[PDB]
Amino acid sequence: SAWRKAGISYAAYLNVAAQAIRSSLKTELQTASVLNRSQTDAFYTQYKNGTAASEPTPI
Amino acid sequence: ATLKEVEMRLKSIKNIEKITKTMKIVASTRLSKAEKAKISAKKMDEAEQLFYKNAETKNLDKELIVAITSDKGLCGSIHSQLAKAVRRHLNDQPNADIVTIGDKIKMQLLRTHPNNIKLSINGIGKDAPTFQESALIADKLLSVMKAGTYPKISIFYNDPVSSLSFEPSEKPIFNAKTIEQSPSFGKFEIDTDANVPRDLFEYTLANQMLTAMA
Amino acid sequence: SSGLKLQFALPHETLYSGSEVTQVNLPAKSGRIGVLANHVPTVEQLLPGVVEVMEGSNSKKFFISGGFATVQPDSQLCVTAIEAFPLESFSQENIKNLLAEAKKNVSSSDAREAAEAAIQVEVLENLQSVLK
Amino acid sequence: AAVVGQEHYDVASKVQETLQTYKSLQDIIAILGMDELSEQDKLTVERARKIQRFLSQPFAVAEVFTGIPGKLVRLKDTVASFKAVLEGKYDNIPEHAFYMVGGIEDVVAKAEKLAA
Amino acid sequence: AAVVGQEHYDVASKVQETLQTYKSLQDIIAILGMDELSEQDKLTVERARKIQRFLSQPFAVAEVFTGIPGKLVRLKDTVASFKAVLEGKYDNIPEHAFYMVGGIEDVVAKAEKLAAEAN
Amino acid sequence: GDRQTGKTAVALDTILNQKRWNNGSDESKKLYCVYVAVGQKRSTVAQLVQTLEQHDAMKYSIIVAATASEAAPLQYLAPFTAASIGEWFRDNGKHALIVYDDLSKQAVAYRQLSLLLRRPPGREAYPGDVFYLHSRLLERAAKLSEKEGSGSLTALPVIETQGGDVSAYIPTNVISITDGQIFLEAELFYKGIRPAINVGLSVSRVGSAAQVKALKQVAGSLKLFLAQYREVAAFAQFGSDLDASTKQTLVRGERLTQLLKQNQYSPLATEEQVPLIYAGVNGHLDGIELSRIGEFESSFLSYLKSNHNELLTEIREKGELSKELLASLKSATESFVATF
Amino acid sequence: PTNVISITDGQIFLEAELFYKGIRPAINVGLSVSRVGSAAQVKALKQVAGSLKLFLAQYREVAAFAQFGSDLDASTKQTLVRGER
Amino acid sequence: PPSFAEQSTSAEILETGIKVVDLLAPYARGGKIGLFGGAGVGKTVFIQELINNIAKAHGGFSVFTGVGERTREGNDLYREMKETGVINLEGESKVALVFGQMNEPPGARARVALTGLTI
Numbered sequence A: 001s002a003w004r005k006a007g008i009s010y011a012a013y014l015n016v017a018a019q020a021i022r023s024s025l026k027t028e029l030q031t032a033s034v035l036n037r038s039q040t041d042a043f044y045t046q047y048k049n050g051t052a053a054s055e056p057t058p059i
Numbered sequence B: 001a002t003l004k005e006v007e008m009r010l011k012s013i014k015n016i017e018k019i020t021k022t023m024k025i026v027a028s029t030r031l032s033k034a035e036k037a038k039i040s041a042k043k044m045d046e047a048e049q050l051f052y053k054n055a056e057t058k059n060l061d062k063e064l065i066v067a068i069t070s071d072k073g074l075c076g077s078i079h080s081q082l083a084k085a086v087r088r089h090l091n092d093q094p095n096a097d098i099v100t101i102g103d104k105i106k107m108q109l110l111r112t113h114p115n116n117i118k119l120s121i122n123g124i125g126k127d128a129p130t131f132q133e134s135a136l137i138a139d140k141l142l143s144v145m146k147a148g149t150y151p152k153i154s155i156f157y158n159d160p161v162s163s164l165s166f167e168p169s170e171k172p173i174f175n176a177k178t179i180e181q182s183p184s185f186g187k188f189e190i191d192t193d194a195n196v197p198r199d200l201f202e203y204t205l206a207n208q209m210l211t212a213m214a
Numbered sequence C: 001s002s003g004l005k006l007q008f009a010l011p012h013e014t015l016y017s018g019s020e021v022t023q024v025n026l027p028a029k030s031g032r033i034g035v036l037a038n039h040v041p042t043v044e045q046l047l048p049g050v051v052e053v054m055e056g057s058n059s060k061k062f063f064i065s066g067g068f069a070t071v072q073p074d075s076q077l078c079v080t081a082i083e084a085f086p087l088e089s090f091s092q093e094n095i096k097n098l099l100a101e102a103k104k105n106v107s108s109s110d111a112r113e114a115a116e117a118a119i120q121v122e123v124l125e126n127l128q129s130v131l132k
Numbered sequence D: 001a002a003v004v005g006q007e008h009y010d011v012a013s014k015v016q017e018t019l020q021t022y023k024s025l026q027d028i029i030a031i032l033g034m035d036e037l038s039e040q041d042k043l044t045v046e047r048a049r050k051i052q053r054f055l056s057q058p059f060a061v062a063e064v065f066t067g068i069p070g071k072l073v074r075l076k077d078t079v080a081s082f083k084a085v086l087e088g089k090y091d092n093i094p095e096h097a098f099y100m101v102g103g104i105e106d107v108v109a110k111a112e113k114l115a116a
Numbered sequence E: 001a002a003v004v005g006q007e008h009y010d011v012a013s014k015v016q017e018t019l020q021t022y023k024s025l026q027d028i029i030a031i032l033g034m035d036e037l038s039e040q041d042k043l044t045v046e047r048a049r050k051i052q053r054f055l056s057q058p059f060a061v062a063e064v065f066t067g068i069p070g071k072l073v074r075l076k077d078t079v080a081s082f083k084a085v086l087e088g089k090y091d092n093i094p095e096h097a098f099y100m101v102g103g104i105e106d107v108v109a110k111a112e113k114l115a116a117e118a119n
Numbered sequence F: 001g002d003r004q005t006g007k008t009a010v011a012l013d014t015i016l017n018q019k020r021w022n023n024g025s026d027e028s029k030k031l032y033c034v035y036v037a038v039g040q041k042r043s044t045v046a047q048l049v050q051t052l053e054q055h056d057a058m059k060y061s062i063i064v065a066a067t068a069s070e071a072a073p074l075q076y077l078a079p080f081t082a083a084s085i086g087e088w089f090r091d092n093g094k095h096a097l098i099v100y101d102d103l104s105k106q107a108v109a110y111r112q113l114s115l116l117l118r119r120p121p122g123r124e125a126y127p128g129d130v131f132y133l134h135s136r137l138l139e140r141a142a143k144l145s146e147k148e149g150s151g152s153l154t155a156l157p158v159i160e161t162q163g164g165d166v167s168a169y170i171p172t173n174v175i176s177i178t179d180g181q182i183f184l185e186a187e188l189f190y191k192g193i194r195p196a197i198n199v200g201l202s203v204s205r206v207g208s209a210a211q212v213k214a215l216k217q218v219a220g221s222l223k224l225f226l227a228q229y230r231e232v233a234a235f236a237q238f239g240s241d242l243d244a245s246t247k248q249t250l251v252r253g254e255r256l257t258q259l260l261k262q263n264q265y266s267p268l269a270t271e272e273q274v275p276l277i278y279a280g281v282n283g284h285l286d287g288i289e290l291s292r293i294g295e296f297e298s299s300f301l302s303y304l305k306s307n308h309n310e311l312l313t314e315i316r317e318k319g320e321l322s323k324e325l326l327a328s329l330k331s332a333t334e335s336f337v338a339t340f
Numbered sequence G: 001p002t003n004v005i006s007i008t009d010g011q012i013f014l015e016a017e018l019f020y021k022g023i024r025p026a027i028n029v030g031l032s033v034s035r036v037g038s039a040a041q042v043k044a045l046k047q048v049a050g051s052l053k054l055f056l057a058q059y060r061e062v063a064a065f066a067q068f069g070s071d072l073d074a075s076t077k078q079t080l081v082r083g084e085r
Numbered sequence H: 001p002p003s004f005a006e007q008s009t010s011a012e013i014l015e016t017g018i019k020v021v022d023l024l025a026p027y028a029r030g031g032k033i034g035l036f037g038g039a040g041v042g043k044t045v046f047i048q049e050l051i052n053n054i055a056k057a058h059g060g061f062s063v064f065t066g067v068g069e070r071t072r073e074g075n076d077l078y079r080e081m082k083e084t085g086v087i088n089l090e091g092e093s094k095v096a097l098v099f100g101q102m103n104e105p106p107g108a109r110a111r112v113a114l115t116g117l118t119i
């Protein structure tokens, strides 16, 4: 709805759309490429100008 | 120089060559797997980049630099070569802030320029990258970095020229401000009332990130 | 061209790439748009819905999770999106509705979760039209 | 096993095989590092070094060398100690908290000591 | 250092440290190569291999093996030459210009010849 | 092989199998055993004799003691002494197995005798004729003619290698003499492979000419699976980047390996060993967990000792595989795999 | 040397490789031991180096993992720094 | 040994009969052949095929010499050579056998080769 103001970016909007589509899978047809395609395992760490550290959080 | 030293050493090196042979075979299997993802990302990206060939989005006139390696190493002159391309482009604009994707290029760049690095992405090189991951990181760039504010965006990836050769390669990203300013842009019919450049720029960022990673 | 070059592209498998096609039918920002062999060069963001691709053969019915339809000016329409879909087999009501109730529950959470869960409720209710 | 007890025999056997797999994997990690292994493989490497440094034992004779009083560790404590380590109950505890230690209670004592 | 001068002793000390470092890294160079080094180690290997070719010296006696006039290179110039090499003032100059050379001025001359000829 | 690897235990349980026939009646299928302890300690020998009493192997055992207490020419003459003892049975149209354990101490004793007798030494101070020693020894074991009466003396010598070396002079000599090796390794024993047989080196030039045909008709695949598996098994220290062919090869290789681990003092009849090989070759164990295999086996044995015992007796009596045997064998195999 | 090390009350071992690495004197800590050791050491010197030798041993042990050139935590990196100093 | 004057000054090719031998590694008529390979590969089958191919082709005979041959394996060899017909116990055996067994002192085994040589 108001994801542009409050929620996601449009790439992330379609990402949540893909997570809902693959979340609405046939469990017979939900292959390992689907679950690995949703295997969100990237860790982001905000550094600073003094190369400080943030939390390596699960994106 | 005993028989014992030379014997144990030769047995160790035989074990080493056996392990490198198995590693080469596993590398061939993973490379054959990853070519599918590379082609399926490239053919998706070409459908949007042929548009940028037609809609000539060529910008004019602070800069964001994104480099792409993995967390692991053991691939030779890649982590240092791409860092040397970073050196080439960063000597031009030393004010250009850096967001690395890959632990090894982060250690390459943090020793030489810890100043410009402001976001680091980890947990990457285990698998072929997915659009879920790439779109998520592109969302994070317009959440903690706000790259639409940045005038010029460069993506640094590694182009396999062959299986036996390579290239560290640069890809420019044009912000959505440039997209309405494009000369070959009114040729394409676009709704003013749908934020199509301001979302297609995000879609461009996500696709170019996915293509650079894959 | 006689017909049209469809470049139907996905991150995992680009299905059509310049496939010669008579009609595409796609849910974009302005609604369901059917485009024939010729069209204005036009860029549209695509809402998640049912794409019907009619060719010299019959018309296939896919679901799409949103994306972009861009008419390359040589009459090459590029659909650039994420999800393909069978006739109805990948769609399952027990999978959709039991998650949809939980997604309405997560839509009561914080706005980072609430907006996304509202999107997910919207997508599952659009998929209810695929359940049809 | 008919002499020293079937369970103790199996515990020593699993310790033996664990250390043998460790010594086997010593060629890769010296060259290609820890990263190339599997998670079960790295778990086995961890637990093997755990058992390895858990064999360290201070000596009252060697107390002039270590400054550490000797531990006379009994058999039935030792059996259950290696049993719990093979079951991986203390995988969270780092390997440094096993060096020159008597029983598993002294393991817990050094592990809580190294909180500082 | 109280015999040859302190600076001579220090220069020779750093040269032996650099070459010992190279000889230590030799096996990893044999297996993996220079790519799997750290950059400090890679710079050290580069400088040491420059030094090794710089060690070679044209002989007036073995001129029939070389066609090259012999090089009677003085001591203090040699000390300052290895000093500037340990300081890395000539890391830009490639390794081959160090080979079979006289003083550091001759390395400059040979690098000029390679720049003018190899181009 | 090297030291302390159950070589003695291998030959010991080899003797202990012969309860199955020496308690019977057919002398042409019976087998009398002569263990030859050379250069050992008295406690080990008495422990062995007590162990033979614990299974009543002293019914058919003959022990020749050449311990390290004894003089060097006693240790020299004791293998030939037991050789004459075995030749007595051999020239009765009978069947005798002898086990020399070892020959390395015996070679050391003969070396000492010759060096103190001021004979000129050769390589590693050995005499020249020491090869002539063992060649004069081991050829005394044979298989006689029906004209003679078809007696049979069979020899199991033991070579204690040093550091896992065959290039040493005495092991090179014995390898040049014998009909192939049963080679052991320490590392496999530390992987708990008991007995720790390197199949990749142990051969028999006789081989399949004197194997049980029921075992023969399933065993030929097994050598092929293991030869495949040893080429591939370095892949096991990686992820799942293997195709189902090589991952199936890992599955078969690990499970057949886990079959071959067995305990000391565990002699298994051939009627017992056949269905284990039939099940392991034919992929029935592939779904079974790696840990349970050895007890699975045991339960499997009890299953066949519960329900298909007549099939086992038919295996033991014929020594071959009928098509009905293969059918009912795979029937019971899939049956117990299903109920396990 | 196999005879002599069997005799003495400890050994002092002097790899020339360390001497070329500027370590003067070039004492291999991992091999040069004292069979008596601390019992005749100065006690003030004992109190300040009561665990120093085994610390340098495990420094060189863990430091071998850093020769691979992988990332290590600040505990091991701290011990690396202190043992290097 | 025969004199230097009695040496045939050009080695022709001994035509064996086997395709691979006559193709790739041709044998000198009166030459030396190093056969490698362990048992179980039909090496005895190979050499019996050589015996028959020489008997049919050139008509010359074969002299086998087992120096240190395993006496059991010598027996199996002799039994096979009876069965494959190169030894005919009543008709014309095409081969002469000398077996210095392993149980013979080294004075025998350093002369078994010369015995087969003289034959």
Ligand SMILES: Nc1ncnc2c1ncn2[C@@H]1O[C@H](COP(=O)(O)OP(=O)(O)OP(=O)(O)O)[C@@H](O)[C@H]1O
Pocket (backbone or CB within 6 Å): F002, F003, F004, F005, F006, F007, F008, F009, F010, F160, F194, F195, F262, F263, F264, F265
């Ligand atoms: N299948 C097995 N099951 C249980 N234990 C075994 C098995 N095989 C070997 N062992 C153990 O290995 C140890 C060594 O065996 P053994 O003493 O027979 O070696 P060896 O052949 O006598 O060699 P050496 O004469 O050098 O000692 C024994 O204590 C035995 O218990």
